[PDB]
Design a protein around this ligand. Structure first.
Ligand code: 9UE
Ligand code: ADP
Ligand code: ADP
Ligand code: ADP
Ligand code: ADP
Ligand code: ADP
Ligand code: MG
Ligand code: MG
Ligand code: MG
Ligand code: MG
Ligand code: MG
Lengths: 370, 370, 370, 370, 370
């Protein structure tokens, strides 16, 4: 009767037991291995730190994110992360509860198969189910129709849905996300004379990004508006104590989402992946889709994304239709909350993958029940 | 179960058995050889005096320190010194106890290899271990994080550490120490008309240094404040009975630490070796390092070093951070006490270099277990 | 019709007028200030020596490199250096010729802006242009496609190019260079009992590095091959006349390039910055890039770098492709020669920044024409 | 336009007006006071004889050298000596000319301050300047680089210089000089049955020293070579008319310079003060220093010092370097001649201490202009 | 097992066999030759009288002291004296016992060499050794540290020693002694109308000196205190029976020791030879030396020497130190007693010069074993 909800992002792990309004444990997904040798006798090594503990001391550690673009690169690392979750933070047993793992649309079969296989074989779990992040956000928004476009560090989905039915041919993933905007925010931040070559320093960047970055209404405008610089430059204060001052970098760093040309990729921006994901949907549901666009996931937390996205689509799609982007407060957790509502539904209880069914049917069954 | 702790300095040897709060035998490391021929029949020659005995009669002897800048120049002399330690003062056997020898960071391999080799082959010892002085002081300070900057007659280390892990690339040694401040205090003391050309006389100087020397808050200030001389000149009274009076020499002798330009070396002073040793450490631990700086070793006993060092770093490093130099009472022994705490730890017992392991693995193994 | 080519390195300044096959003046970039006071009456002070003159007498001087990691730390010093170039060595006037200054990729805007500003305002120059070092080396190699990875004392670039087009997102700079391998060669050389604390002595080291250092094929092999030491130890003879003998230090000093772990930085080595700089390039040009890798800059002069780099990439990248590192003879000047060929091209004459255009458009225009 | 050069030695005063190739007046610095009462009526008392006059009649007088180890013991005596110089021998006025006084390195401030003070206040002089003897010898040698090691009766300097710059930390003074070799030549001469208890007799000794003393190539050799005595014993003929014969005393008297052990002092000999004064100089200038060693001052006039010093250093310093000791003819005056060349230089005229500047700035200014 | 101790003074010969507390034979060293011809038939001529016998009849004899200032002037005479010792008074054989001869510091080699040579060749002795008088007195005083300043008729030594080690450079001999105070006491005694031109009469003087002479506390005082003469004039009664009365001569005769100016020599007095002999000793032992000064030898027997010497040194040396002159009772024999204690020591037996070693090694060996 208690469903255990773990949504594995890239660069966050949000885990809380079902029925709560906000997740218990929110900690970045990081596996630190101390680079230099330990000296002081009596210290507890704990060879590989994990999660928040390992982001409290980042000066000693070489951090490796195990998830890059929503696809596990290194399993040992992830497995260790989950272990940290269930034991050190959720404080729930593996064998007692069913758990809900979350996954990205169009994600290689390898992640499903090997993900569950690692859940049943190494951990022991009674039942399991892995749902597309996008759709889960839609439960949270509590409405039955709309595009759900989320962007987490790894991946950015656009999954349209019409009145409860999902469109498998419309789904569209772009790879511009939080970690490409940080790994970009360095290439730009060099311009000012600052420079960050190291992992720990990359996370310092990520903080800069979260605090000081906004998205311009019209970028061509603001690039001119910054010639005369008054309140645009905000002073960020490092863990060091040195005082940085970031210029244009504030609004040209997050803009990479709308123009990927900057990052160098040939993909289309967010506005043309939303709009395009619609244009693949039949001409009859476009009304509802244009109406219900729901932002989700962290990367869209930037101040003023709603306005820019709306105006931009409106420019793209015919003027007759009203475009409304619903940007709910506390959307950073939308995927998780959707995990709660979903896992708490009385009819949903039929769909869990069962310890038995896995045992007899092999790990490949995951593909059939998703 | 009794660990024997010998910390070999340059110009002191502090030896006491583990578990004591202060070392049993503290005597300068000196090998006197009487220069003139002995006459009185029945006198006991004991050709080469050692330690305190040889500093009670310094008029007959030509003293030779066997350690110059923490690196053994002449082995026979040192070997003789240790011999004096274990037999005439510690009163412990060599073969009964394990002994802990202490060494300077970035110290030529020769001193490790040949040091142990002389411990196992000529003396017979069951087990042995040689630890960096800096880190040992940090156990004594009982805190797990901070810069430990010591200066003994030979050498001055800055070894930062963060939460039990040591940073091998940060370590920084400067060669300004007690013996360069005495050998300088002569070049200055000549200015007053006094002059000391001889070894014995050099030690007289060292006494002058210990008693009458303080470190100015702001040197440029005091050089002016001494134009009108009231209480600055203190009268020191020699073994001779003649009465010296030392002028500015009091505060411009120990200042050489902060400005090496005076001694002539091109190295940076103490404040820029501390601050620089930090700047090589990652931007994430700087908080803790700036906070926990621990003075250690004799040469920092000068009255008022804390204030000057703090203000000086604070001037160097960004003003936002609080700098606190912990100058514990009885820091002259910090390295030794750290020898006690360390050697008394239950987990440490695994690390000793074993008579066997040396016998089979050759003397080179020292480098692997330090 | 005569273009004046000055490529500002860190620790060298290579200046020669266009059309020559090798640069006229090659002298280290050093600003000496004599530390002690001058005595002999009638001597010509010339307060701050510069370049080769100041490396003929390094015993009196405290040397300060004005360029650290390709980014001017202290302008007065550099300005003085150039002055020394144009007047005392190139023997060309500033106002007569256009000059070509060279710069490092991803280099803070400050160096461009202030560099030209100092060229037009203090010196007077008719026209000016500042090109990325990497690309300039590629003209010299006379081929239109390849990675150009150079390492000068300050910086090491990897700038890929495909058939005349440059990839701005692929560029990758690492900070391991000649001066980190010298400043490291001390930390290691201490191990043998030698030690160099002073600037002048650092340059002595740099000589040791240039003459006696080679790069191992497989390092793990040679670390074993040195247990039995025959021809590995080479005897270097100081300006003093004392005879040093360097051990392993020969091949473990330059290896820091391939493993930065030694220096302590968390960056990837040279092989993974080359290989990684490729992996950011589209899958279609990889053929040409893997084929045409061009070593450049001084730091790669080490005997046997070609073999190690090739085998190492080959291990990294799929075996099907042939990797060929072109290591042209006289690659130390590749950047300069590229300065000659480039500045001598008939179409290039359109791109110079003009005295006028600077006067009206402010110093910021540099960013637009590079 | 005529500079007056007085170099105050211990046991000589060499005074001549600038521009001459050799000094006008050379007379020993001695203040005789007739011990017994005068009888013959009409004799001119002139209570205290001075200089050569007082060494023509030494039987009546008790001689007191006012300079002992280059530091004025008794001022009245010296003041009287100078007076004798300017009036009775130089025949120049005090008030007409600027005068150049000479002083020993590391000499107590008292001698500078009180020396000038006695020059401006009691004598009246327009301008004055006091230069280190060592450096002045170096002008005379006309070369810009080398160790200048002089030994006058009082003091023996080693002052290295590199290409016009002086090294203040290298300077090294030893106290073995002409007067310790005479006061020693008595302790040895007693061995033969001769003995000299009185001042006048001490000067007789000094003559013996000057005429009959040479320095052995290898002392241990000659101590054996004197067992069979042929030409080693030379017969000296006193003012008395009695005929002395001096044995080994010839070469073991001046050897005290190379071994101070004989005199009893703990200082190092001349060879280790030269060689050591080098070893304190940076490793870059050692070439030039080893090359240019310049003997100077009287005490080095001994026949065959060049050979012994050279071979001895060569034994000390690495064999690769050529050691050359330049022992110019007429080196007894080197300090003076250097006084001439220096005082005659057109740029030097700026440095004189001025009657005015002294009047306003107090006598302490001497320390600032030296 | 019986050591024969002969201490040859100038004007005494103190000979007694080892182990006695006071010497057996004490007789003046005099060789009388009767001047006039003998007449009475049957008288025993014994051409040259010696010692006490020759001082019982001094009217017939012309006395010649063979020792003048501790250096044998005439050998035949001395040889005869010893002969008188061993046969007529010690009553010991030459060949049976080893003998200890005593000598003055800084004494011409001639006296050592020829002294032993006369002991082994003419007399036959099994073993021999010749020790410095000063040091021997120090055994007698039974303390291991102090200045030993003795004055016998010939010579006055100051030989400092520190804790068993002797300082060869400190030794200092002055020639003011008993025989210069007698030969002076005549020049003064003439003043009163008495006069002694002849040898025998000189010895009468010496008696006057011994009995009636004291040393003033402050001489300038007493020269005034004698204007009113009460108890100062003491009446001495000659062998003649005539009654002398000596005036000031009492205290101005022995004062010549403290002021040699009177005798005419240029040497310093006793107080400045003690104090100066200290000042040549290192600044570290001065404490002990100032403390332990030991008077010795006859000439210091004068009533009240202790007080004057102490106050006088105290005036010379810094007031902080306590000066104590130990003037042991029966110090006239101190040198001899020291001969007993020394010769009776069990370890001393190794040092004797052996009949053999002399036979093979020639007489020169004496110099090596002293
Ligand atoms: C406390 C001491 C001494 C005294 C009791 C202290 C008092 C205070 O000195 C004086 O006032 C005397 C005078 C002096 C002369 C002039 C003057 O304006 C001030 C002082 N100074 C001298 O004669 C120098 C001579 C000297 C020799 Br050689 N080479 C040297 C090298 C450099 C400097 C000087 C010298 N001098 C006394 C010595 O070195 C002796 C060997 N010093 C000592 O070992 C100890 C006992 C130190
Ligand atoms: N308050 C914020 N403002 C701006 N960006 C943010 C903020 N919080 C997080 N981010 C960005 O979003 C990322 C977190 O996304 P997340 O919700 O974890 O996606 P996922 O759950 O799919 O990993 C962070 O790494 C950061 O780049
Ligand atoms: N009380 C004091 N005041 C000032 N300086 C001191 C004092 N005690 C010792 N020193 C200086 O410190 C030195 C002792 O340093 P030490 O603790 O022995 O270092 P190490 O143990 O590394 O040799 C002495 O030689 C002296 O120069
Ligand atoms: N012959 C050589 N062998 C090995 N290393 C060399 C050699 N010559 C130069 N170097 C290294 O390369 C550096 C010179 O690089 P340089 O070509 O000046 O780069 P930049 O022009 O970017 O400064 C030197 O400082 C030295 O460290
Ligand atoms: N011809 C000579 N041979 C040997 N020694 C000499 C000779 N002439 C002088 N001396 C020694 O050198 C001393 C003179 O040194 P001097 O040049 O006066 O030095 P300073 O000028 O510093 O006093 C003399 O006292 C004597 O001891
Ligand atoms: N009682 C005395 N009072 C004063 N002076 C004395 C006394 N006895 C001896 N002397 C002096 O001391 C001398 C004896 O000295 P002595 O002890 O023989 O010295 P040494 O043994 O070296 O010859 C005598 O010649 C005399 O001048
Ligand atoms: Mg997400
Ligand atoms: Mg220490
Ligand atoms: Mg370059
Ligand atoms: Mg001289
Ligand atoms: Mg005697």
């Amino acid at each position: 009767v208690q469903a255990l909800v773990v949504d594995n992002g890239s660069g966050n792990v949000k885990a809380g037991v079902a029925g709560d309004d906000a997740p218990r444990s929110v900690f970045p997904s990081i596996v630190g291995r101390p680079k230099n040798p330990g000296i002081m006798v009596g210290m507890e090594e704990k060879d590989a730190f994990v999660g928040d503990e390992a982001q409290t001391k980042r000066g000693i550690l070489t951090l490796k994110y195990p998830i890059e673009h929503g696809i596990v690169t290194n399993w040992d690392d992830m497995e260790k992360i989950w272990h940290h979750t269930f034991y050190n933070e959720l404080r729930a047993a593996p064998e007692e509860h069913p758990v809900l793992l979350t996954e990205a649309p169009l994600n290689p079969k390898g992640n499903r198969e090997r993900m569950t296989q690692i859940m049943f074989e190494s951990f022991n779990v009674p039942a399991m189910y892995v749902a597309i992040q996008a759709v889960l956000s839609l439960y949270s928004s509590g409405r039955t129709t709309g595009i759900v476009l989320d962007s987490g560090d790894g991946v950015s989905h656009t999954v349209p849905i019409y009145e409860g039915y999902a469109l498998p041919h419309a789904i569209m993933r772009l790879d511009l996300a939080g970690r490409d905007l940080t790994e970009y925010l360095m290439k730009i931040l060099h311009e000012r004379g600052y420079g960050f070559s190291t992992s720990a320093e990359k996370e310092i960047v990520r903080d800069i990004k979260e605090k000081l970055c906004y998205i311009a209404l019209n970028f061509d405008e603001e690039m001119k508006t910054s010639e005369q610089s008054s309140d645009i430059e905000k002073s960020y204060e490092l863990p060091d104590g040195n005082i940085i001052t970031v210029g244009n970098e504030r609004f040209r760093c997050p803009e990479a989402l709308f123009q990927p040309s900057f990052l160098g990729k040939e993909a289309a921006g967010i506005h043309t992946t939303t709009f395009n994901s619609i244009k693949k949907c039949d001409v009859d549901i476009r009304k509802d889709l244009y109406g219900n666009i729901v932002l989700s996931g962290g990367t869209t937390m930037y101040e003023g994304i709603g306005e820019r996205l709306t105006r931009d689509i409106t420019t793209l799609a015919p003027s007759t239709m009203k475009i409304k982007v619903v940007a709910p407060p506390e959307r950073k957790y939308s995927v998780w909350i959707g995990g709660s509502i979903l896992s708490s539904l009385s009819t949903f209880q039929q769909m869990w993958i069962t310890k038995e069914e896995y045992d007899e049917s092999g790990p490949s069954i995951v593909h059939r029940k998703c």
